[PDB]
Write a protein that binds this ligand. Structure first.
Ligand SMILES: O=c1cc(Br)[nH]c(-c2nnn[nH]2)c1O
Ligand SMILES: [Mn+2]
Ligand SMILES: [Mn+2]
Length: 180
């Protein structure tokens, strides 16, 4: 375990349960694919923190069953006309009226930005990338959040990294490119 112990100690139970459900759907064992497990929890938590930093500004799409995620996406499209994305995004921004894809990477933010923009191939979805180094990259350099909220996300990601490092897990996690 070790990685599993750390995941259960640093993420709240709701997130852990959501991550285990995601992995039981994919067919993957969180006791085996430990680095994926941690990356899923981290990404889930960034999405929830992002949303929570809003007069009810964000709708969370990530973390729901696919049925219900698509139900939410469809509802938003029918009530705004916003083009329906091709891949499930992570949040909807009602203030700006755009979907958001959140990326968390152990590599350089620009590399992973390029990789996500190339994947989603949709000019509609705003993209926001975070590293474990306090760096971010976002479409048009439009970061959406205020400094406080982005700083809190940066802090938590760095803290997770240092917690992994103190437990000797960071090097495997960093080289694992799995989940990001
Ligand atoms: O950032 C992400 C990385 C991976 Br790998 N997958 C997703 C995803 N999968 N289904 N909905 N979102 C992300 O948002
Ligand atoms: Mn997602
Ligand atoms: Mn994402």
């Amino acid at each position: 375990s070790a990685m599993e112990d750390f995941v259960r100690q640093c993420f709240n139970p709701m997130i852990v349960e959501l991550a285990e459900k995601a992995m039981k759907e994919y067919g993957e064992d969180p006791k085996i694919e430990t680095n994926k497990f941690a990356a899923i929890c981290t990404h889930l938590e960034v999405c929830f923190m992002y949303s929570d930093f809003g007069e009810h500004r964000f709708e969370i799409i990530e973390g729901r069953d696919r049925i219900m995620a698509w139900t939410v996406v469809n509802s938003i499209c029918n009530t705004t006309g916003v083009e329906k994305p091709k891949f499930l995004p992570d949040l909807y921004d009602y203030k700006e009226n755009r979907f958001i894809e959140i990326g968390v990477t152990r590599r350089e933010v620009h590399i992973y930005y390029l990789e996500k923009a190339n994947k989603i191939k949709s000019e509609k979805t705003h993209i926001h990338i975070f590293s474990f180094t306090g760096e971010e990259m976002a479409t048009k350099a439009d970061y959406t959040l205020d400094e406080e909220s982005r700083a809190r996300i940066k802090t938590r990601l760095f803290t997770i990294r240092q917690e992994m490092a103190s437990r000797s897990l960071w090097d495997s996690f960093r080289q694992s490119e799995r989940g990001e």
